[PDB]
Paper text:
The Vpx/Vpr family of lentiviral accessory proteins usurp the substrate receptor DCAF1 of host Cullin4-RING ligases (CRL4), a family of modular ubiquitin ligases involved in DNA replication, DNA repair and cell cycle regulation. CRL4 consists of a Cullin4 (CUL4) scaffold that bridges the catalytic RING-domain subunit ROC1 to the adaptor protein DDB1, which in turn binds to exchangeable substrate receptors (DCAFs, DDB1- and CUL4-associated factors). CRL4DCAF1 specificity modulation by Vpx and Vpr from certain simian immunodeficiency viruses (SIV) leads to recruitment, poly-ubiquitylation and subsequent proteasomal degradation of the host restriction factor SAMHD1, resulting in enhanced virus replication in differentiated cells. To obtain structural information regarding Vprmus and its mode of binding to the CRL4 substrate receptor DCAF1, the X-ray crystal structures of a DDB1/DCAF1-CtD complex, and DDB1/DCAF1-CtD/T4L-Vprmus (residues 1–92) fusion protein ternary complex were determined.
The structures were solved using molecular replacement and refined to resolutions of 3.1 Å and 2.5 Å respectively. Superposition of the apo-DDB1/DCAF1-CtD and Vprmus-bound crystal structures reveals conformational changes in DCAF1 upon Vprmus association. Binding of the N-terminal arm of Vprmus induces only a minor rearrangement of a loop in BP blade 2. By contrast, significant structural changes occur on the upper surface of the BP domain: polar and hydrophobic interactions of DCAF1 residues P1329, F1330, F1355, N1371, L1378, M1380 and T1382 with Vprmus side chains of T79, R83, R86 and E87 in Helix-3 result in the stabilisation of the sequence stretch that connect BP blades 6 and 7 (“C-terminal loop”). Moreover, side chain electrostatic interactions of Vprmus residues R15, R75 and R76 with DCAF1 E1088, E1091 and E1093 lock the conformation of an “acidic loop” upstream of BP blade 1, which is also unstructured and flexible in the absence of Vprmus.
Residue numbers in the entry:
A (entry chain B): 1046 to 1060, 1068 to 1091, 1096 to 1314, 1329 to 1372, 1381 to 1400
B (entry chain A): 1 to 288, 296 to 548, 551 to 744, 749 to 772, 777 to 1015, 1025 to 1114, 1123 to 1140
Write the structure that this text describes.
């Protein structure tokens, strides 16, 4: 596994990927800028990724063509500022979440029949199930709510005050198998509706995220085994970071909090090894990746705007060899 | 709207894994070899290896283990493929029927997870309890082996150690115990675990985990009585069995890393070891118990991928980087010190890294020259399709209707006279050296057309004409006897032996014997229909008791006994077009019969000379003209030449007949010839000329190896100088000090680069460094004419031969890169211009660039090169220098470049392909369209102006289409992927052309040496062949019970879709080899309405383009 790309490439024809991913995912290139016609809060790509979906501080939802950069539509969704967006991989549904205008979250039928499908009044945050997007999970303080999509009615609530950590930024979410839930640092067996384990609280304001392998749990800086429960690794750089993986499952995007700092960074999801630490030199509010590892959308202000990045290309400064 | 056809030209050669065992029966010894998708089964003997069965699977073999469970009659095979299909195979053989039967199967792919980057590891415990698999990181998959697990259901076990190096099951433990090497940040370690089928978990290992060498890479389990585990690193070898520990660090190991191992003695007493650079070792475990570790060097072999000790000091060397070997080990050192001598050698084209298509012997017909091999196994490989002839004499003689060699001197053994039959008359020619001049001869008439003549017994000659049968003395040269039909009727069909003669007069057959001065009439018959053809070729020594005949009205081949004319066996033949040639010969001690028809069809049977029995009717097609068959011998082996519009030689390879082409335009008549001016030659006549020449070897593909002894990288052909340009690289050790004399140090004229453009890098002396060279090679003799060495740390990456701008001079153009190991991406490059003068090599021009020139290509008199992430376009000055004109910046690393007229197709590292254009009005580029999907490209080619092809590291192919009819400007630039197909090879080169003389044609070469063809089809042809392909999978049962649908399904780590746009040509061509009623089972009421014969018409025309 040589270091120099040209030597390593020659070995491919004759006879690894980490050094290649280290090269590509330390390189981010801004190409275009997405403004609004009359001088944002959230960002996400559509299902087939041909449009970009943006949330505003007035409760509106904007849609831009990634090819042209014009507004294709405009919608009013809430009376509070939008906080989070998540379309279904079907291309049929969308989830919204505002700050304080009840109902806080809602489920939406996409543009064909575009209309409100169900209401989620009590829940700030919302998130689809991972494998089969047939159920929906929402967060009310330290309480998790699991809902059905077609009926809109509630299936079960998950809370246990004897075991709570009372995290600030708590967000309950499913595992890739749809048979576990993590809330407030507590594993729940979805079927048996009981508690499995209560992780120790090492942070003030981070709940945790599952790893796609179904083997690990990512609390702030601690990787816990999902069955042994032993501490497997300590990743210091993830402190206060909201962690997103790419579609293939090889790379992590971490976002420093305190809504976010001036820099994000990328990690190698297999060995949790740092790749790079990119500094855009602006305050960051949201980010998301396409499933093609082509575009990176970032919201940031100088007046808030969404600047679009191309992956694998260099900035001019490093490209000028000073 | 895309329609394509993919077929295999050369099955892969490289060896990927090989195991030995008692598979066919508990008595004989088998050797199994696993090439990419094919496995080869052999029987080990004293003479060598005897092949028994050769089978293709729907998958590439990743694990291949033999095991005999309890109470089983003989060993069973276990195979896992790359797409995680498991199977257990048994060998059934009743008579001549050999079929591979499947006990159990099933897919063990996990629904979630990423495959380990280190790779798939497959092992089996001695107890035959379970199969252990490392498929994904952090897990350990187990397949129980109880007789009731007929579906191969697996379970996983959480393995906390993530980066596992190698795993083995141990011997002599009270419970199934494993031993593996894992890598922590605190170096790498060795640890043991037990396995429980009931609890489905792990339990404490028998001994404490321990530290090992930081480059420990291999784990070997020693059998009882010893037990324990040997672990091999780059510096030292250790022994591990609980309390015991032995460790030695022989200095010989440090030079090169150990790759493969093997047991010799079932006690574990003696093990073999191979390294990268060819060396072969012997490991010893000294008893009295497990006293010592000792290492001895044995010799040098081919770079070993796998090693199998067969028997009695005979070792098989499975090679992936060069030719595989069969090796004998002698205890007495040879003269030069070695213990190793090579018995046989097996061809390996892989790995192919580049190739070109050049018309060498026959203009219009292609051949490949491939850059093949590896470090010391580097070689050029010249590949010809079909057999050619080498002329020596050309005479204008139109109208020839027959040819017969003849030795006129009864004393000398060489032919000296060639007899030519024309329309209604005959002439004679003698051969004084090379002069060919008219000759007369007493006894022979020249006013009648000849049907046969030649030497007969008793020192005599015979001429058989339309009028009579004439027997001629030898020494006085006079007519001694003449035969005529009793009513003075004409002769219709003739056939003659050294002592026997059979002619025909309409329906009547006459049998004659040749005695001194006598034509002895023996028998007579009257036949049911007219006579068409005859043959009495004696299959033994020669007095043939058999006469083969085919008739007119009742079209049929009959065997008759001599002199009885008693019928023995009749075979009906379809159709109402008569046979026109029949023959009996002997291929490799098997007796066959050949019968050609008037449309260019050929039936061939088997023959029991004792009983005259024809068996296993088979049918082939040779062109359109009627076929003329005739026997010739070459290299003391008998073969058959078939004269038609597609001249063909018939021979036998491994007891099956094979039909190799003849690289000629058309041959009407043929005879062998051996004269004092034309030794062992052939005499050929079309209907306009008479040629004489010598023949090549009798093989479908002839492969000429040119060992270079260093690593080749690229190649291109400069016609205007009769030369090849080859880039290379050899490894030297920093004193730079070479390892062995290779081609770059043994050129006639050598040179070095005197550039000084690059006026901070430290080398630890002993480290390995590549040194690159430009090699120039003759077109005929392939000897290294000149070797230009490049600078230090400068790699040669791109090569083009062309003329640029208006300069009529033709050049060699090279693009390089400054490669320093501590740097991550090269920052310095160079583009050099050469011309090869009459004998010398002249440096013309340079051009400094800030990156690597991964690819460049001639673009309309302009040079079109790629630097690290830029696509640049140069012009060639009237002052003979380079002036950039354009750029293109939107890509990660521009690695692969191809050009149609003014279109540029660019392959990137992770974004698949770009389509660029050149606008003459603006002097810049315009990005036309792109493909967004993250495909890790490895090769690319332009098919036409609207379809584009490439292959990525996911073992796949795809085609992108430009929707020129654009509703919107966005839909315009989506390169829509309309072809998808899982191939199973790693393609490194595409080039246009075909290896067949006389739409579209693209050849590609892979890592396993596989050579494939990709041609286009039309909408009618696609929809039809796609129907056959579903219908064949209904019939052809795949080994392992794997669906063809699943195999060819396009599969990356991100997508998995069925295949569309391509057709599996290897599957379509297997339609011919299938049985007859199964064909009728395939053609059942398929409209598109043709059935069961019109398809054989199609597939045979498809097997024709390669």
């Amino acid at each position: 596994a040589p270091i120099n790309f040209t030597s390593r490439l020659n070995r491919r024809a004759s006879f690894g990927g980490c050094f290649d991913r280290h090269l590509i995912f330390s390189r981010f290139r801004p190409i275009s800028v997405f403004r609004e016609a009359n001088e944002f809060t959230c960002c996400a790509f559509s299902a087939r990724e041909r449009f970009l979906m943006l949330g505003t501080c007035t409760g509106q939802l904007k849609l831009y063509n990634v090819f042209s950069g014009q507004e294709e539509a405009s919608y009013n969704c809430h009376n509070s500022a939008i906080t989070h967006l998540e379309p279904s991989r079907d291309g049929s549904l969308l989830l919204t979440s505002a700050t304080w205008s009840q109902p806080l979250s809602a489920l939406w039928g996409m543009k064909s029949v575009f209309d409100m499908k169900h209401s989620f009044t009590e829940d700030h945050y919302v998130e689809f199930s991972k494998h089969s997007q047939d159920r929906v999970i929402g967060t009310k303080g330290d309480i998790a709510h699991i809902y059905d999509i077609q009926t809109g009615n509630k299936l079960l609530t998950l809370f246990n005050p004897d075991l709570a950590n009372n995290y600030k930024r708590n967000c309950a979410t499913f595992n890739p198998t749809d048979d576990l839930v993590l809330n407030d640092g507590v594993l729940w067996d979805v079927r048996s509706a009981q508690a499995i384990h209560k992780f120790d609280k090492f942070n003030m304001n981070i709940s945790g995220v599952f790893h796609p392998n179904g083997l690990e749990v990512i609390i702030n800086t601690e990787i816990w085994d999902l069955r042994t429960f032993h501490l497997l690794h300590t990743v210091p750089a993830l402190d206060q970071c909201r962690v997103v993986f790419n579609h293939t499952g090889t790379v992590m995007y971490g976002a420093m909090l305190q809504p976010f700092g001036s820099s994000f960074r990328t990690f190698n999801a297999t060995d949790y090894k740092p790749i790079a630490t990119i500094d855009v030199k602006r305050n960051i509010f949201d980010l998301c990746t396409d499933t093609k590892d082509c575009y990176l959308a970032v919201i940031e202000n100088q007046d808030t705007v969404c600047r679009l990045y191309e992956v694998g290309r260099q900035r001019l400064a490093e490209e000028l060899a000073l | 709207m895309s329609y394509n056809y993919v077929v295999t030209a050369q099955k892969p050669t490289a060896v990927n894994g090989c195991v030995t065992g008692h598979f066919t029966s508990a008595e004989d010894l088998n050797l199994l070899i696993a090439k990419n998708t094919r496995l080869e089964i052999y029987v080990v003997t004293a003479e060598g290896l005897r092949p028994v069965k050769e089978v293709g699977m729907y998958g590439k073999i990743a694990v291949m283990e033999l095991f005999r469970p309890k109470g089983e009659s003989k060993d069973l095979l276990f195979i896992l493929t790359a797409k995680y299909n498991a199977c257990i195979l048994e060998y059934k053989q009743s008579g001549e029927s050999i079929d591979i039967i499947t006990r159990a199967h099933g897919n063990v792919q996990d629904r979630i997870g990423r495959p380990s980057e280190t790779g798939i590891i497959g092992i089996i415990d001695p107890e035959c309890r379970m199969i252990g698999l490392r498929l994904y990181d952090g897990l350990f998959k187990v397949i129980p082996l109880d007789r009731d697990n007929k579906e191969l259901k697996a379970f996983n076990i959480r393995l906390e150690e993530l980066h596992v190096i190698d795993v083995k099951f141990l011997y002599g433990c009270q419970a199934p115990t494993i031993c593996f090497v894992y890598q922590d940040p605190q170096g790498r370690h060795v640890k043991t675990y037990e396995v429980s089928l009931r609890e489905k978990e792990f339990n404490k290992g028998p001994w404490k985990q321990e530290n090992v060498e930081a480059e420990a890479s291999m784990v070997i389990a020693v059998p009882e009585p010893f037990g324990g585990a040997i672990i091999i690193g780059q510096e030292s070898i250790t022994y591990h069995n609980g309390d015991k520990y032995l460790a030695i660090a022989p200095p010989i190991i440090k030079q090169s890393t150990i790759v493969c191992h093997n047991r010799v003695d079932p006690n574990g007493s003696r093990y073999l070891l191979g390294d990268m650079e060819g060396r072969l070792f012997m490991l010893l475990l000294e008893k009295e118990t497990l006293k010592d570790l000792r290492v001895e060097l044995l010799g040098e072999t081919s770079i070993a991928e796998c090693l199998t000790y067969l028997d009695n000091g005979v070792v098989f060397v499975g090679s992936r980087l060069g030719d595989s070997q069969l090796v004998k080990l002698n205890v007495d050192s040879n003269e030069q010190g070695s213990y190793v001598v090579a018995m046989e050698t097996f061809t390996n084209l892989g790995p192919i890294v580049d190739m070109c298509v050049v018309d060498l012997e026959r203009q219009g017909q292609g051949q490949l020259v491939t850059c093949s091999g590896a470090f010391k196994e580097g070689s050029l490989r010249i590949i010809r399709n079909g057999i050619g002839i080498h002329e020596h004499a050309s005479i204008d003689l139109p109208g020839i209707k027959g040819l017969w060699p003849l030795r006129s001197d009864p004393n000398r053994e060489t032919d000296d006279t060639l007899v030519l039959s024309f329309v209604g008359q005959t002439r004679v020619l003698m051969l004084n050296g090379e002069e060919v001049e008219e000759t007369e001869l007493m006894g022979f008439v020249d006013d009648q057309q000849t049907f046969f003549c030649g030497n007969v017994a008793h020192q005599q000659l015979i001429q058989i004409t339309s009028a009579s049968v004439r027997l001629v003395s030898q020494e006085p040269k006079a007519l001694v006897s003449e035969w005529k039909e009793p009513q003075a009727k004409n002769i219709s069909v003739a056939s003659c032996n050294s002592s026997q003669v059979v002619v025909a007069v309409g329906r009547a057959l006459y049998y004659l014997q040749i005695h001194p001065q006598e034509l002895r009439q023996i028998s007579h018959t009257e036949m049911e229909h007219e006579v068409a053809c005859l043959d009495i070729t004696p299959l033994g020594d020669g007095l043939s008791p058999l006469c083969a005949i085919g008739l007119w009205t009742d079209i049929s081949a009959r065997i008759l006994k001599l002199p009885s004319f008693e019928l023995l066996h009749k075979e009906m033949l379809g159709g109402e077009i008569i046979p026109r040639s029949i023959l009996m010969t002997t291929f490799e001690s098997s007796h066959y019969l050949l019968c050609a028809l008037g449309d260019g069809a050929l039936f061939y049977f088997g023959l029991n000379i004792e009983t005259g029995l024809l068996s296993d009717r088979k049918k082939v097609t040779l062109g359109t003209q009627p076929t003329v068959l005739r026997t010739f011998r070459s290299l003391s082996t008998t073969n058959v030449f078939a004269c038609s519009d597609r001249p063909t030689v018939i021979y036998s390879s491994n007891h099956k007949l094979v039909f190799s082409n003849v690289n000629l335009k058309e041959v009407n008549y043929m005879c062998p010839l051996n004269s004092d001016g034309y030794p062992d030659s052939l005499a050929l006549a079309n209907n306009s000329t008479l040629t004489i020449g010598t023949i090549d070897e009798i093989q479908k593909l002839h492969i000429r190896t040119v060992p270079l002894y260093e690593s080749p990288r690229k190649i291109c052909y400069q016609e205007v100088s009769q030369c090849f340009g080859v880039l290379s690289s050899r490894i030297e050790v920093q004193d730079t000090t070479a390892l062995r004399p290779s081609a770059s140090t043994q050129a006639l004229s050598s040179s070095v680069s005197s550039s000084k453009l690059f006026s901070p890098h430290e080398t630890s002396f002993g480290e390995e460094v590549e040194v690159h060279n430009l090699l120039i090679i003759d077109q005929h003799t392939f000897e290294v004419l000149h070797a230009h060495q490049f600078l230090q740390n400068e790699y040669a990456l791109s090569l083009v031969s062309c003329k640029l701008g208006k300069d009529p001079n033709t050049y060699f153009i090279v693009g390089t890169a400054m490669v320093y190991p501590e740097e991550a991406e090269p920052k310095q490059g160079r583009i050099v211009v050469f011309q090869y003068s009459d004998g010398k090599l002249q440096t013309v021009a340079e051009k400094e660039v800030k990156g690597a020139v991964y690819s460049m290509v001639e673009f309309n008199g302009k040079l079109l090169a790629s630097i690290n992430s830029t696509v640049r376009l140069y012009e060639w000055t009237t002052e003979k220098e380079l002036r950039t004109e354009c750029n293109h910046y939107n890509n990660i690393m521009a690695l692969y470049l191809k050009t149609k007229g003014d279109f540029i197709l660019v392959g990137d590292l992770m974004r698949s392909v770009l389509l660029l254009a050149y606008k003459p009005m603006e002097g810049n580029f315009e990005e036309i369209a792109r493909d967004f999907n993250p495909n890790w490209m490895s090769a690319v080619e332009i098919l036409d102006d609207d379809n584009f092809l490439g292959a990525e590291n996911a073992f796949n192919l795809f085609v992108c289409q430009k929707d020129s009819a654009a509703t919107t400007d966005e839909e315009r630039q989506h390169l829509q992927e309309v072809g998808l197909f899982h191939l199973g090879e790693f393609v490194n080169v595409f080039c246009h052309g075909s290896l067949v003389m006389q739409q579209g044609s693209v050849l590609f070469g892979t890592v396993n040496g596989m050579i494939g063809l990709v041609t286009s089809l039309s909408e009618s042809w696609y929809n039809l062949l796609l129907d056959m392909q579903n219908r064949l999978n209904k019939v052809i049962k795949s080994v392992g019970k794997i669906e063809h649908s699943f195999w060819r399904s396009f599969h990356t780590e991100r997508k998995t879709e069925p295949a569309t746009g391509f057709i599996d040509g290897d599957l379509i061509e297997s339609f011919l080899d299938i049985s007859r009623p199964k064909m009728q089972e395939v053609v059942a009421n398929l409209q598109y309405e043709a059935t069961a014969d019109d398809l054989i018409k199609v597939v045979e025309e498809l097997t024709r383009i390669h």
